[PDB]
Design a protein around this ligand. Structure first.
Ligand SMILES: [Ca+2]
Lengths: 105, 12
């Protein structure tokens, strides 16, 4: 088997339970929620429409219009991190890309 | 009718 597997830790998974409880309260269907309820969270966090698009762009790598529990966790993280007073680089590093959506060349 | 472009935010 592979022992020396280069698998970078997804820093979003550290506070995922929290975004999970927020994900399940927006009515998840088969592991995804509608962008309407995500939109709702986003606008509750008082982020400008420009920043809203920023977050979506960074959260949904494949752009399937729906947010998986993984994707919403990432989005939610960016959101609350903005509320923390942090800013976003607006670029997606490999340790932010979901394991099942990432490539490394 | 609700319709988006590249997300529910980036609608024109
Ligand atoms: Ca997605």
């Amino acid at each position: 088997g592979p022992l020396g597997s280069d698998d970078v830790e997804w820093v979003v998974g550290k506070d995922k339970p929290t975004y999970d409880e927020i994900f399940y309260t927006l009515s998840p269907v088969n592991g995804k929620i509608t962008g309407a309820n995500a939109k709702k969270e986003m606008v509750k966090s008082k982020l400008p429409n420009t920043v809203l698009g920023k977050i979506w762009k960074l959260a949904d790598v494949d752009k399937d219009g729906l947010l998986d529990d993984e994707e919403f966790a990432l989005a939610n993280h960016l959101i609350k991190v903005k509320l923390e007073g942090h800013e976003l680089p607006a670029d997606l590093p490999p340790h932010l890309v979901p394991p099942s959506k990432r490539r490394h060349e | 009718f609700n319709y988006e472009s590249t997300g529910p935010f980036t609608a024109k």
